[PDB]
């Protein structure tokens, strides 16, 4: 869209279109947390790391998806290489969660929530893992559905990774605390 001519309403139309498409996924993450409230009430430090866990999940997403798309749009990876990039993105997801969680557990300890150390340590690895895999098989699934991945991957992997970052962090919290 050409910018300097458009008025506030002209901008607002397109911008609210996309932002209201994303506020629905915001709604579903809110509903997931409301469902898991039973552990947030038990310990209130859990909420202290939802932003960092989501900004690592839906970031490993928008990074692996970009990496796969820019290598799938130069014919470096054919679309039939999902099972060969799978056993590579799983490995890099492990080798990257084991350091992102290594830094975040240091942060949690410096905060002083020893009951949070195990849950954060397991959860950041299990979010980076199942966000890297879902950010790497999002472009293949999109291009196999018939849609250009670079178009509708940037928001889609962010939503599909923050939902499944909450749904993993809170589940690990319920398994490790109550």
């Amino acid at each position, epitope marked *: 869209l050409v910018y300097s001519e458009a008025g506030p309403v002209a901008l607002w139309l397109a911008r609210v279109r996309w932002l209201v498409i994303l506020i629905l996924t915001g709604m579903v993450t809110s509903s997931i947390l409301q469902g898991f409230e039973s552990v947030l009430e038990a310990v209130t430090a859990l909420a202290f790391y939802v932003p960092v866990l989501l900004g690592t999940g839906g970031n490993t997403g928008n990074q692996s998806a970009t990496l796969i798309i820019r290598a799938l*749009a130069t*014919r470096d990876l054919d679309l*039939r290489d*999902w*099972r*060969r990039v799978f056993l590579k993105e799983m490995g890099v997801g492990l080798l990257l969660g084991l350091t992102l969680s290594f830094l975040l557990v240091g942060k949690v300890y410096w905060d002083g929530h020893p009951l949070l150390l195990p849950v954060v340590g397991v959860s950041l690895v299990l979010i980076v893992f199942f966000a890297n895999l879902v950010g790497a098989m999002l472009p293949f699934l999109l*291009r*196999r*559905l*018939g849609v250009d991945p670079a178009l509708v991957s940037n928001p889609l992997v962010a939503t599909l990774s923050d939902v499944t970052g909450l749904l993993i962090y809170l589940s690990v919290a319920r398994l490790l605390l109550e």
Partner: antibody
Amino acid sequence: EVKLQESGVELVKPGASVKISCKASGYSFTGYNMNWVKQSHGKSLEWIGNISPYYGTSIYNQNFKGKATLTVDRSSSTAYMQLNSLTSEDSAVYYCARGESFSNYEGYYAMDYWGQGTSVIVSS
Amino acid sequence: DVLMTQTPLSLPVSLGDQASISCRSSQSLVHSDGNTYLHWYLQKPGQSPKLLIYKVSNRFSGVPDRFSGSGSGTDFTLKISRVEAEDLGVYFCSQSTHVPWTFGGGTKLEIKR
């Protein structure tokens, strides 16, 4: 079914640069990758490029990297091969063949439908 | 890449018999995805090679049931039930796993006069 029609007979001088045209018809040219394959003077084939129309980029045979350049035009629905510095060994017939879906909703993955042949002859 | 090949190069058969075309790869053409890309093309004399057998088990559309493609691993084979007069030509067995997707040497289909 699908008719894949390309340019006619071709004649060139050694060291020239010929641009073989392959127009698509009967299918959405944006969503199927065109494969360029050359047949020598009564011999086996040799796959010499796979142009992806939607992205406009291509993957190339090792023996033909540089000796060939694939470009397309989505609106024109034509697949273009541009031979470069074509020596006497390039005196062959050059097929274009639609051969891989963009959605990969085809199963197989090589050579759905082929052109008709653009005899490329190098000589004085 | 895979310096693929066919045997024999000439196949003297009759009209109404069974003809078996071997196709022996150089290295195994099983993909990381994992299915046997050993496509078979028939190039009728003075035409363009149209696809006959894909993913050696399967068959293409518009293809009469006379053609039978089987085998797996590195050794693949296309067999005819009854050689008809519309099936003569040269038979290319290609691959699609390892770039470049090389083609076979191709074998003709003569008549055993």
